[PDB]
From a paper:
Type-A γ-aminobutyric acid receptors (GABAARs) are the principal mediators of rapid inhibitory synaptic transmission in the vertebrate nervous system.
We successfully obtained good crystals for a GABARAPL1–γ2-GIM complex, which diffracted to a resolution of 1.95 Å. Generally, the γ2-GIM appears as an overturned hook lying in an elongated groove of GABARAPL1 formed by the α1-helix, α2-helix, β2-strand, and α3-helix. In particular, the aromatic side chain of γ2-GIM Y405 is deeply inserted into a hydrophobic pocket of GABARAPL1 formed by the hydrophobic side chains of I21, P30, L50, and F104 residues (together with the aliphatic side chain of K48). Our structure also clearly indicated that the GABARAPL1–γ2-GIM complex is further stabilized by two charge–charge interactions: one is located at the N-terminal area of GIM–GABARAPL1 interface and is mediated by the negatively charged E402 of γ2-GIM and the positively charged K24 of GABARAPL1; the other is formed between the negatively charged γ2-GIM residue E406 and the positively charged R67 residue of GABARAPL1.
Author numbering: -4 to 117
The structure:
Amino acid sequence: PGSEFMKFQYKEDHPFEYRKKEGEKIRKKYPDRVPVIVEKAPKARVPDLDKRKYLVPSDLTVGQFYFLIRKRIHLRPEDALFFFVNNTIPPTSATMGQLYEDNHEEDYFLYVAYSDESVYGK
């Protein structure tokens, strides 16, 4: 009850220095995009996406990114879905670039989890 640490398989599978090289290479090669890892939250009976690493246009809004991911995920129209970045639901009107700037980790990746619940891990 309360918060829970967001675990990402991408961080389990790749050492920090590997992730930081990739994050920096991406930011150098595609300055108008932000690298984003998208994985499921625990206890949610939802699909994995076909892939977890995304290069997102910086000016795409969070609302638009939600549209694309919700369409990509294999879910029924009645299924609820919420995004979490650093344990909080991001603003719909934010750009992915702003969200990235404020929330990316030391490896220069932004981490997004999704769940059918409105609190991460519940």
